[model samples]
Target: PIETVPVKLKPGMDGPKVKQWPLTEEKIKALVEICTEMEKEGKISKIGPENPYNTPVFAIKKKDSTKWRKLVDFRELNKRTQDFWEVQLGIPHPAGLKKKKSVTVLDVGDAYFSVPLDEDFRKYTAFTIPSINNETPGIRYQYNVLPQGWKGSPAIFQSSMTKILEPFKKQNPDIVIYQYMDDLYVGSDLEIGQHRTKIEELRQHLLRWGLTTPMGYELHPDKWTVQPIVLPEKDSWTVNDIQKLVGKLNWASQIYPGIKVRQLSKLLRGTKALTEVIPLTEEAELELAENREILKEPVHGVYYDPSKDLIAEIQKQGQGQWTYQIYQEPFKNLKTGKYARMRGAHTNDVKQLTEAVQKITTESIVIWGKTPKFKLPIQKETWETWWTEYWQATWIPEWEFVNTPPLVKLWYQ
Candidate 1:
């Protein structure tokens, strides 16, 4: 806690002289509830007229529009603030596991707030919220901890976390702890049983040290449900709407890799000004399905971890649909197979089939994994042709090929 110092300002620099943005009564009420909790938690405190510094507070309506998140406009403050040496440590690969399966990503609660600010410098972080009731006057408050909008917060908090977890790392050398700021990835090469117990042990140690995980990426359960964002027939939205939708899509696609935004290019291209209105196109409507699907599903596509073995499985279904799932254990047999754009062609030709597999394998090798092992189910005749002509010359030396049996017949049919 002693290491958490106040942010230094450049010489002759003072806080913002700007006014706070105009906000609706509803927005002010929403922010009041949030500020109240932060105040109770000691992350923020009420300040009087003695505080000369003041910054504006603004809000961004969340994608679902059910809620708003308050943000302080620290641009004025940052210009006066001294620069901090910030570095983002790269996420460490799970080198311990021969077959890295499970990764538990632990996120810290109030990551920046945990760091205390210096008593004197807290004034520069002051912000004021106008009262919802016309009779009551606005009140000023200053962050008692590192403010999110501050440029130095990330670097400061990162160093603090690195120091805090130093003991945990030394104590349990077996448990590999990778800290990228607030997120800690706890894992190891140890057997599943030992790993589980060690993780439990680490959990206990974390609890003692006041490091705890927050409630899961838990947004408002009902209001935030992923549904397609369709414009009413003939209705249009502002460029701001398109921007917000794009931002949400980009984030969701990071978690659920299936959400595609490429289809919204037409809509996105029309976004020149935030205030400009744009009509929805067919492409935009179709692409919104990606968002709906992302919201409708609770699962995230497992990121390809290079430390583990890469298994690629291709499934050929009705209407020339080919899907592939390349993954490690738990979902060992499972692959988040994406649709291969090989439509309008008969998949019966041996050369066509082998080339298709080769294309996926080549793409996988370049982009994702080490020598990829593939599981493909094919007709007996096709297998013979593929093995004799393609498998030996290209795949035998590097790739691992497994014969997949035909689909089982159901008696009810």
Candidate 2:
């Protein structure tokens, strides 16, 4: 197991009055039990701080359920320490990956706990929680691995993950694979089997690489959502259940992107209204499952981030502020006779950003006529008069092969 040097604190420090944290006897045991599991896995362990500096731990029980999640408060310790760096479990955002026929999500379970550390430095990450049985002195537990709260942990994890995954992206002439930390998004099935093989090999190799491999590693098949553990019976949940609900959604929302998953964001705001745990609910488990199924499909407005037609090209340009304009692309005809490379792209003003790429066309007349991007700058009356001259212009066979069109600017501003 790999570990950091013991964390150094201010000149003098002292552990908190554990019982004063307001946790009950029942809550105490639950918190301690979770710590013990981390202890066995070398993620955390018991400690007796010489200068005291013990952080207290508590539980945020699930709504309407008996289950509890132990949380370690490292705010005081994290702030007092000097500036540092880290990588972490973050809200999963939608990625711009090429579409594939099938996708597999490994859901590395317990990704944070899977990282391991040594005994000597574990106490630096330690905290205090009451004895499970309501005994004295409470319990002192320090992390044996990189704890999620530490500000420096995210950078470390981010750097480690990127270095390990970037190379295979170029296993071919084009970037066929896409990666997002521990979660990978594969774009091209062009060599899906080969890439899968390469990744499996990388996984084993990653274990041995110091930065790539230490000890802790976790994931689950619930890649689409977190398994609902608590289901509330009544309405208006306790702050605890609300806390659990938000966190549960927060993780899933990122894992699965879309407007549907965003539905719970309102609930997140609702949960914020309370201070303590909420042991309440309203068919929560069922609702969460429904939300899960809805989000599992992974959509970009029913389809996906489009890449075909001129939408992709139009989108590549800088966005014009204060307008519906998405992006602008300029076209130039190098030689009038040589303007043969015109793929005849249409930059129609699609109603919404999410419109299907399949819905956009390259045709010149119908929808492309009203297209904002490709339209000639001249007014309709002027274009009517100019059309006669434009159409009569002669074409050069050599220039047909040669593209020499003026950069057809999209916007005047």
Candidate 3:
């Protein structure tokens, strides 16, 4: 079947014509040039004046390049467009990057335009350019392929890309493939040789499917490593800057759980406005220093291993806040067997809490909270219990010399 996507519009709804913004002489030239190129590439076609739909068209300089990228004001059109019903998958994070040696990022040039649009619904993508001169009057053009800035473009393009790459994925189960929109990531545990071959194979497959040619595009060891983030030395700080720093540190803490930043209320609650410049107070300085220190020398933490026993600890620290920690059965001192916690989330909703536990594991667990009980059979079990009772003997008269009975004590060690 031909992979053509329709611009599905809401029933009995049509986009209102948006007024076009006047462009300068230079911009008009650039717009004409871009449209001509797209015409030659068969991405767009000039349409007659009878069509009702028209949206403003503009151009912006492409990043790091002199070429202009044509853009359309599709807000009006998108409002009338029906939602694309497909489960858009979230790309998983490359959490344990230290486990991999080399990483390759592939960029698919002209990604959105690669997909063909339904011939019947092309009118919905209509855009207009102003008259360049008397000889060349204004003209309207509609896209033959999917255009950028539409709400459904990503979903439609992603669906198409996923369908094309399904076979490649099944064949190479060993290689991890992360497809995020048009940016494809291929990686493998084996450093370079296998990864290089896999990436090449992916490129060939992509070429076979008629996707445009690609254009472009670390960890520490000992003692719980962290990649330190750089902060400006001389630049004065703004409320936004402080917020940015906190966000970066928080993200860093996710991977290296030992890099905990505390005492940041002073920095966070310092200002009323985001743009207001603020000087670092002594208290704020200390908090910032603490963050820096932890990032530089992160506190030691544990790494997860499936073979080892897992300890999932859950507690309610305050009202509506449930905190949890997951540790890979802590290192036991051979002489003294003791379990130590190594690293895990807080949630307010019971549903989220239930979900958190549900996703963790199916392993058997022993409890020591509220009514201590065992829900499942365990191989190793040890227990000791004791009770002590004492009563104050201040009832004796102070004036008279009196001896109190010996205090009874119980020990379970």
lDDT of 1: 0.56
Instruction: For candidate 1, write residues 1-413 as lDDT tens digits.
Output: 36645555556766677776556777678778889988999999999988877787755443223566566766566556635422232223343422333334454535677778778878878888887654576777999987765655645666656677778789877655554333455656556567667667766777777766431111111121112223222356777777666765665554466777776656666328788887777777777754675555555554556567676666655444455555565433323433444556534445444655755553343233223566666665546334433321112212334565343211000
Model 3, 63: alpha-carbon shift in Å? 7.2
Instruction: Determine the backbone clash count of candidate 2.
Output: 43
Kindly report which residue pairs in candidate 1 clash with one another.
Answer: 324-337, 325-335, 325-336
Candidate 2: C-alpha lDDT: 0.39
Q: What residue pairs clash in candidate 3, if any at all?
A: none
Select the stronger candidate by TM-score from 1 and 2. 1
lDDT of 2 by residue, 176-209 (tens): 2332222333333435566466446555654555
- After superposition, the stretches of candidate 3 with alpha carbons farther than 4 Å from their true spots are 1-5, 11-13, 16-19, 60-69, 72-82, 85-105, 109-115, 131-137, 148-154, 157-160, 174-182, 185-198, 215-413
Per-residue lDDT tens digits of candidate 3, residues 329-390?
A: 43211011111121233332333333334322211111110011111111121100000001
Ranking by TM-score: 3, 1, 2
**Candidate 1 wrong stretches, greater than 4 Å:** 1-6, 16-19, 40-42, 49-52, 56-82, 85-105, 111-115, 132-137, 148-160, 171-204, 215-413
